[PDB]
Assembly symmetry: C3
Homo-oligomer: 172 residues x 3
């Protein structure tokens, strides 16, 4: 599928993000089943909120949940499902499931794709509304099964550290 | 594609439904061409009505038209195209084309995915509006070529019977 | 992917068009990377305008940019991403990038799919609004990299000539 996409053209500040779910999609949590390579519904989330940004992952990375590193990509409008955006990390939302670490990175489009985010260097350069919504969305991002907690934010450096760790984890 | 998805985790009341077309999609009738594995437009339907629910099929089933068993899945909001919903049958709309039987099952999300439909056991537990719309939509679900009739509804048991028959038909 | 789809059932007036981007999609320019077979974002376009029609290509054709022949397909409503529409050419918008020729064909659904466009034989049979929008959209259809110009329109015959040339180019 996306295996032949590098994690980026110049890591960790220049990455490729495969988009699973476009911005403003309904509050539905999915997962890619590695065994069948199909997208499954996990949860119809108990929130009126919709996806605050486009949602997917960096190809050829490995996070602590066995899945590729998660990324939200802020764009002017929702992109096509399944498309790939060359991107630049600007921050990270820290999450722990009861199974471990579970970071959600924030990225903007690469300067080659648009001039609009060129001076967005940190996540705090984005509207406070968007950051609020992002936090509140993932506070409800979990399955029904009894047995997720949203901590704080990390900066651009912390996001780049997450990527480097995630890339090293995959090649290992 | 979806061949490695079982027809369900516990048949026939616990099924997997691959979604071709999300709820509220334009009135366009498609078919999967088995020979090329691509989705083709068959008809721009002569109705203002839009898809009343998500529309797809159960993998590894065989209906009397050579295609997998058709299913509509009622959800809070439209799902992503191509995603898979673990589901529970609640009824069936009976249709005959001039080529034979052509049932359209009604299913809700599995209890693992949402609490909202837990007490929806029969299709008649759903709003009468939705059932009207479903009937009126498929009354227009046909190609232009000269040479479809919508009868009535069957209950949850009848839907489960359709699934068991469809699963038996595939393994044969 | 779409390699097993013929360029049409009866060339050049009866073609098959694989749709990448539905009508009314956000102003985002994509390309299919032949090496990875994935859809990439090229540009978030500097226009408020959205896709004026469905956008894709004819399988098994070869244009002067190494990509299959581009086509816009006018429909009542946006189609599903990735679906295939049997279509009929009615005109062409001429474009030159700084790299050569770059025609954008205009097609309507085949008579088998809908009665609505049966008497639309030329692109000038379509609303002048739509033609204006089409022209203005592609005036902004380009990457940011320094180094596209929209000329005029050709008729149905000229579009069919583009197809025949494109089909001959592929078999060569
Ligand atoms: Cl720009
Ligand atoms: Cl719930
Ligand atoms: Cl019609
Ligand atoms: Mg993920
Ligand atoms: Mg079907
Ligand atoms: Mg193209
Ligand atoms: Na994850
Ligand atoms: Na069928
Ligand atoms: Na082109």
């Amino acid at each position: 599928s996306y295996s032949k996409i590098p994690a980026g053209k110049d890591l960790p500040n220049d990455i490729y993000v495969a988009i699973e779910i476009p911005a403003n999609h309904a509050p539905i949590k999915y997962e890619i089943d590695k065994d069948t390579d199909c997208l499954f519904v996990d949860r119809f989330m108990a929130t009126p909120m919709f996806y605050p940004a486009n949602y997917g992952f960096i190809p050829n990375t490995l996070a602590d949940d066995g899945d590729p590193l998660d990324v939200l990509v802020v764009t002017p409008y929702p992109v096509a499902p399944g498309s790939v955006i060359r991107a630049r990390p600007v921050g990270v939302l820290h999450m722990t499931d009861e199974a471990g670490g579970d970071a959600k990175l924030i990225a903007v489009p690469h300067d080659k794709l648009s001039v609009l985010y060129k001076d967005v260097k940190e996540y705090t350069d984005l509207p406070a509304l968007l950051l609020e919504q992002i936090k509140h969305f993932f506070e409800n991002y979990k399955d029904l099964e009894k047995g997720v907690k949203v901590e704080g934010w990390g900066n651009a450096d912390a996001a780049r550290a997450e990527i480097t760790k995630a890339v090293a984890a995959f090649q290992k």
